[PDB]
Design a protein around this ligand. Structure first.
Ligand SMILES: CNC(=O)[C@H](Cc1c[nH]cn1)NC(=O)CN(CCCc1ccccc1)CC(=O)O
Ligand SMILES: [Zn+2]
Length: 954
């Protein structure tokens, strides 16, 4: 035996397709541990989840655990450099993050497989000897203030806290998880709190070993990982902390039968119906709430959503069980509202209860349970291999809930059929404990309350008793039926033998005027799945704002019309994705290959013989108007990025231009557009997965054939296959475009240093430079200078051209952000000069590892190929080519590069900046900048400049 280990679990049940190896165990200090050994893996990973979270904040210091989560990254006793951790990761091809829910704090990272031990050692120190440096705390508190500022004007975050503020304020549920500058500094200072103590106190009280789960994944054997984990983690001290419980629901009697009217930020209409329920988590083997979710949330014929959608009152619905914390859960049903639907909220809920009643009337249904259990068993067997960071983070979390042996299956497999639990949860979905929330702009001015944290305007009301009764006496309604056998359930899982002529990259197997078929049968993953991707080209999908609107509308109407039929396939692991592009349309069909050709044929056939329902047209149109308008409520950085897309692309229709042109969109006009669009096309497809050359040609040909038979599609001409170019910027020039965000009181900035076209050479100069500056940018602009929560840098790539970019969202003005990036950029040339050839070579090696990391799942491989095909570079072997070339570069290559294209006095510096100002408008040396040329009109700017070439295909 071994003193450090309390036990090794028995065999960990995995899918029989999972080649990875697993060992579970419990340390002597009580920490639950999963070990994953994957000798193939390119990146390694570890995560730790602690069963404590914002629900355990001192009442008097809101968001202390979320703050503590930020601080652990910023220095321990053993590795005291503020950024040892994030720099060690950067230089060895890793990344990291954390999050805090009300009951968990979850920390994970990935790294190159050679450096797991180094990564992990630095990591353990978080849980033993964090420094909470006084100077780090002062600074990092602003990052948290930004995190919340971001969220303040977000409609989902406000609704989330508003729920917490209307249950029992005495309950921990009512707490503010995020914290801000106010709750973390201003106010604790006023009240003579030393926050460094309070962080040391909270860390020491709750970061106890008995409350921790670790997962590690690496190339090492299971024995090697064991020794490793034991070594680094046995010294975490066990304080035997009792795990927090919340037996009492935060919605007590007086919180039930309430109605709330709420004003949103975006122009949206929504109804949130919600009942309290007990903790259902222990019933995971039978899962009563999933069963009722499957049903109430169903979207097929017969379903609740269906009648709500035919009465033209709602558009979408979600319902099912919602997590609470240990002790309570909720059951929700929320829908959005047509303008008509808003005036029928009473009737909508009554339909809701008529449906619930139908379920009571029919009793539990084993055949539905069998169906659910079967889908999940299939889902489990053929689960795609996950990226290791996500996987460890996830499993660390759930080690807290399941026996070691079941950690892999517990969330998937079903075992027990429980008509009793089903009937019991069903007894709680009653008018006597309902909550109703309506979110609409029409409550503007009519509100009397304000939510402290986010500022939400709202009104609370008792639901009239006769209203409750009307709901209590819900009749059956003959429009509601249980769903019938799901015919889309796959049964054929045969993995076709690997062909004689199969290749490692996709092959151009068809090159006609109508279509260009790229194909690869799967040589890696061997699951009964495929992806079938299609670009359809029409110059009419974007010839003008009007047309762009129509392509959009057409596609939403089609998706809406297929929804009832398609929902079945989606439960059966077969889904599709269909949207309009600036080039025509896109279509992806993904999942188990068995019934895949059925659904595809149904889609094309529909596309080509489409009949629009006047009622449905009118609603989607209204919903689209709002959507375009709602862009004004998007975040300042998302705005900045948007403007820069509009400014650098040859052709691009502005949200305003679409909004305006959307009124000339009549039903007559739409009916005429469809056959026009569908009459001349080109198709470029990539077919990839468990399929053969001959089946692939058949599928492609069936698509074409359907379009001819029904829309008379003829091929498009080679010269009409027009791709849009990027604006070419003048050597030494600098432009600024300035706009205002009228909703958020932060500002946004995008700075673009354009370089040259994409070419093996020019590609890797940019990438290495980005790699070297990646963490220092984060570390300088955020950690040190605390300019904002959002601080991004990296390559930008569009229409075959490229360049470096910075994105910041900040409280300080853009002219200010400009200058500190510039400051930073000098710091950088200064660093490349001072760095060891070996430091230089580490960065080369990290980019190397990132670039070469093998896809772990089909979808991921497809994506890499598709990027090659949509960009028309067709460079399928690019990763080996570009990497070979990378290893050839030297410090002087990169300085020359920075001196030519990037330094402030660079002979070919091409700088464009988007400044997005807020609602309302020591440190390194910043260089003196030129008078920028302020862009007045986006069209003029474009007319007056060269356009770039397009990239030659490989
Ligand atoms: C398993 N149950 C079901 O089948 C249905 C499916 C459905 C589709 N359309 C309609 N209903 N239920 C659901 O999907 C929804 N609920 C709640 C979401 C709670 C949430 C809120 C914000 C942020 C993170 C999660 C469960 C879930 O997410 O699985
Ligand atoms: Zn955070």
């Amino acid at each position: 035996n071994n003193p450090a280990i309390k036990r090794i679990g028995n065999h960990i049940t995995k899918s029989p397709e999972d080649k990875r190896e697993y060992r579970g165990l419990e340390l002597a200090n009580g920490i639950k541990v999963l070990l994953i050994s994957d000798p193939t893996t390119d990146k390694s990973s570890a995560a730790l989840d602690v069963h404590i979270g914002s629900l355990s904040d001192p009442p008097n210091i809101a968001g202390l655990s979320h703050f503590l989560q930020h601080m652990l990254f910023l220095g321990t006793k053993k590795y005291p450099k503020e950024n040892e951790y994030s720099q060690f990761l950067s230089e060895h091809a890793g990344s990291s993050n954390a999050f805090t829910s009300g009951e968990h704090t979850n920390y994970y990272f990935d790294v190159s497989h050679e450096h797991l031990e180094g990564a992990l050692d630095r990591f353990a120190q978080f849980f033993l000897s964090p420094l909470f440096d006084e100077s780090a705390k002062d600074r990092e508190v602003n990052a948290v203030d930004s995190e919340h500022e971001k969220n303040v004007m977000n409609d989902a975050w406000r609704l989330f806290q508003l729920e917490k503020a209307t249950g029992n304020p005495k309950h921990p549920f009512s707490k503010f998880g995020t914290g801000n500058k106010y709750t973390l500094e201003t106010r604790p200072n006023q009240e003579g709190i030393d926050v460094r103590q309070e962080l040391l106190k909270f860390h020491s009280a709750y970061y106890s070993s008995n409350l921790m789960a670790v997962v590690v994944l690496g190339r090492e054997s299971l024995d090697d990982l064991t020794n490793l984990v034991v070594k680094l983690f046995s010294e975490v001290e066990n304080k035997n902390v009792p795990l927090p419980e919340f037996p009492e629901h935060p919605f007590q009697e007086e919180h039930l039968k309430q109605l709330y009217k709420i004003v949103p930020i975006k122009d949206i209409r929504n109804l949130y119906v919600t009942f309290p329920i007990p903790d259902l988590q222990k019933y995971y083997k039978s899962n009563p709430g999933h069963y009722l979710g499957h049903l109430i949330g169903h979207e097929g014929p017969g379903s609740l959503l269906s009648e709500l959608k035919s009465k033209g009152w709602v558009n979408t619905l979600v319902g099912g069980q919602k997590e609470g914390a240990r002790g309570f859960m909720f059951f929700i049903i929320n829908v959005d509202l047509t303008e008509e639907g808003l005036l029928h909220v009473e009737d909508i809920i009554l339909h809701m209860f008529q449906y619930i009643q139908k379920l009571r009337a029919e009793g539990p249904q084993e055949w539905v349970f069998q169906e659910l259990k079967d889908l999940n068993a299939v889902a489990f067997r053929f689960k795609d291999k996950e990226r290791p960071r996500g996987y460890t983070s996830k499993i660390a979390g759930i080690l807290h809930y399941y026996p070691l042996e079941e950690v892999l299956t517990a969330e998937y497999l079903l075992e027990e059929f429980r008509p009793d639990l089903i009937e019991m949860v069903l007894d709680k979905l009653r008018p006597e404990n309902v909550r109703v929330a309506i979110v609409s702009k029409s409550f503007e001015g009519k509100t009397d309350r304000t939510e402290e944290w986010y500022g939400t305007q709202y009104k609370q009301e008792a639901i009239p008793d006769e209203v409750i009764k009307k709901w209590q006496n819900a009749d059956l309604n003959g429009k509601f039926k249980l769903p019938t056998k799901n015919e889309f359930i796959p049964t054929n899982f045969e993995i076709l033998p690997l062909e004689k002529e199969a290749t490692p990259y996709p092959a151009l197997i068809k090159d006609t005027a109508m279509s260009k078929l790229w194909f690869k049968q799967d040589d890696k993953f061997f699951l009964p799945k495929a992806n079938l991707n299609f670009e359809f080209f029409s110059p009419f999908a974007y010839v003008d704002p009007l047309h762009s609107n129509m392509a959009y509308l057409y596609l939403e109407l089609l998706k809406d019309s297929l929804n009832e039929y398609a929902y079945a396939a989606e439960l059966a692991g077969l889904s599709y994705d269909l949207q309009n592009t600036i080039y025509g349309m896109y279509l992806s069909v993904k999942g188990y290959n068995d019934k895949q050709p059925i659904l595809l044929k149904k889609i094309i056939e529909k596309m080509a013989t489409f009949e629009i329902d006047e009622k449905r047209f009118e609603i989607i149109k209204e919903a689209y108007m709002r959507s375009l308008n709602n862009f004004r409520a998007e975040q300042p950085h998302q705005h900045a990025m948007y403007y820069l897309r509009l400014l650098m692309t040859e052709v691009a229709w502005t949200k305003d231009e679409l909004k305006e042109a959307l009124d000339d969109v009549t039903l007559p006009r739409l009916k005429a557009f469809i056959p026009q669009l569908l009459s001349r096309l080109h198709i470029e497809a990539l077919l990839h997965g468990n399929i053969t050359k001959q089946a692939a040609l058949g599928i492609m040909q069936m698509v074409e054939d359907t379009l001819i038979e029904h829309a008379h599609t003829k091929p498009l001409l080679p010269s009409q296959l027009v791709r849009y170019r990027e604006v070419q910027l003048p050597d030494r020039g600098w432009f600024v475009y300035q706009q205002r965000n009228e909703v958020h009181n932060n500002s946004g900035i995008e700075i673009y240093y354009q370089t040259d076209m994409q070419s093996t050479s020019e590609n890797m100069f940019l990438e290495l430079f980005a790699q070297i500056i990646s963490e220092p940018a984060f570390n300088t602009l955020r950690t040190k200078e605390q300019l904002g929560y959002i601080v991004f840098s990296g390559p930008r790539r569009a229409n075959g051209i490229q360049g470096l970019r910075f994105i910041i969202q900040s409280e300080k003005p853009p002219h200010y952000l400009e200058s500190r990036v510039e400051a930073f950029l000098i710091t950088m040339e200064k660093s490349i000069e001072d760095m060891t050839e070996e430091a230089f070579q580490k960065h080369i090696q990290a980019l190397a590892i990132r670039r070469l990391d093998k896809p772990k799942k089909l979808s991921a491989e497809s994506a890499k190929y598709w990027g090659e095909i949509i960009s028309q570079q067709y460079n399928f072997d690019r990763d080996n080519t570009e990497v070979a070339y990378l290893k050839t570069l030297t410090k002087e290559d990169i300085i020359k590069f920075y001196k030519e294209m990037l330094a402030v006095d660079a002979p070919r510096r091409h700088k464009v900046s988007v400044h997005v100002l807020a609602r309302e408008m020591n440190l390194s040396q910043a260089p003196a900048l030129p008078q920028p040329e302020v862009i007045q009109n986006m069209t003029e700017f474009k007319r007056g400049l060269p356009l770039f070439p397009l990239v030659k295909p490989h």
